[PDB]
Amino acid sequence: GVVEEAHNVKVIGSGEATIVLGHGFGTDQSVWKHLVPHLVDDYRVVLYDNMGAGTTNPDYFDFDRYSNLEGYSFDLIAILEDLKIESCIFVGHSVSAMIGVLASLNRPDLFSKIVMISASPRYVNDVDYQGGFEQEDLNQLFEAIRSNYKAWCLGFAPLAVGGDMDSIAVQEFSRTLFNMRPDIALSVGQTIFQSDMRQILPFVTVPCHILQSVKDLAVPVVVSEYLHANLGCESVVEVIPSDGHLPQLSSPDSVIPVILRHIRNDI
Known part of the structure; x- marks a missing residue:
C-alpha cells in the first residue's frame, strides 16, 4: 500500500491486542529494537517511520502539512485505519508522544493507553514554565x-544520547541524524522545538504513562510533573535512573523493564 510503503510500516503478529510504536526526531523505528523482542509474544506489533525521517522519501515531505504536529497525527490515524486497527496501546518516543496525544483528541476510541518516553509539551522556558x-x-x-550539518550531527548526537560519547548508540543516532535531508532536519527541528502542546493537555482523555530519563538533555524532570498535573486524563509518572533522550536504545537493561511494566499494567 502507498501509505504503508511511504512510512516503512512493519506489522509483526496478529490479533486484537495491538501495540503501535512511534519514534522521535532524528531516529527511526530502529530505536525500538530492544523493546520489540519482548512484545511480539503478546501483541500485534506495529512499527512505522515519521515522514521526514531519513528512511523516508524526501519528495513526500510536505512542508505545509508538517508545519503543525497535526500533520503527523493525521499520518498516524491513517496508518491505523489502513491496518484496520480499532484499538491500540500507543508508545510514543519524544515528539511522537505529542503526536499520539493529538491523534487521541480526534480519535480517542483508537487508543486504550499512551505510553510516553521522553515527552515534552513545550521546550521553551517562560517566566512560569x-x-x-x-x-x-x-x-x-x-x-x-x-x-554545517555533519558537524552539527556529530556534536548533537552524544548530547542527545548521553552516556559515553563513543558508544554504539551515539554512533547509531549520529548516522540516523545525518541521513535526514538537511533542510528537512532544520524545518522539523524548528517545528518541534517551537511547539506548544500545553494548552490542549486538559482535553486528553486516554490514560497516559509518562516515562523519562532522570538526565535528559531536552526534558527537565519538572516536565514529567507538568504533564501529570495538567493532562485531563488519568496519568502516572515514572522517572528512570538512566541517562539520555533515547534511553530505550542506549540503556535498555535499566529502561526496558520499566517500559514493559507500563505497557503490561494499567493505571
Whole structure:
C-alpha cells in the first residue's frame, strides 16, 4: 500500500491486542529494537517511520502539512485505519508522544493507553514554565544546523544520547541524524522545538504513562510533573535512573523493564 510503503510500516503478529510504536526526531523505528523482542509474544506489533525521517522519501515531505504536529497525527490515524486497527496501546518516543496525544483528541476510541518516553509539551522556558531551553539557545542550535550539518550531527548526537560519547548508540543516532535531508532536519527541528502542546493537555482523555530519563538533555524532570498535573486524563509518572533522550536504545537493561511494566499494567 502507498501509505504503508511511504512510512516503512512493519506489522509483526496478529490479533486484537495491538501495540503501535512511534519514534522521535532524528531516529527511526530502529530505536525500538530492544523493546520489540519482548512484545511480539503478546501483541500485534506495529512499527512505522515519521515522514521526514531519513528512511523516508524526501519528495513526500510536505512542508505545509508538517508545519503543525497535526500533520503527523493525521499520518498516524491513517496508518491505523489502513491496518484496520480499532484499538491500540500507543508508545510514543519524544515528539511522537505529542503526536499520539493529538491523534487521541480526534480519535480517542483508537487508543486504550499512551505510553510516553521522553515527552515534552513545550521546550521553551517562560517566566512560569521550565522546558529546558531559552529561545536564544534554540536560535544558535538552528544556526549550527544551517552552517554545517555533519558537524552539527556529530556534536548533537552524544548530547542527545548521553552516556559515553563513543558508544554504539551515539554512533547509531549520529548516522540516523545525518541521513535526514538537511533542510528537512532544520524545518522539523524548528517545528518541534517551537511547539506548544500545553494548552490542549486538559482535553486528553486516554490514560497516559509518562516515562523519562532522570538526565535528559531536552526534558527537565519538572516536565514529567507538568504533564501529570495538567493532562485531563488519568496519568502516572515514572522517572528512570538512566541517562539520555533515547534511553530505550542506549540503556535498555535499566529502561526496558520499566517500559514493559507500563505497557503490561494499567493505571
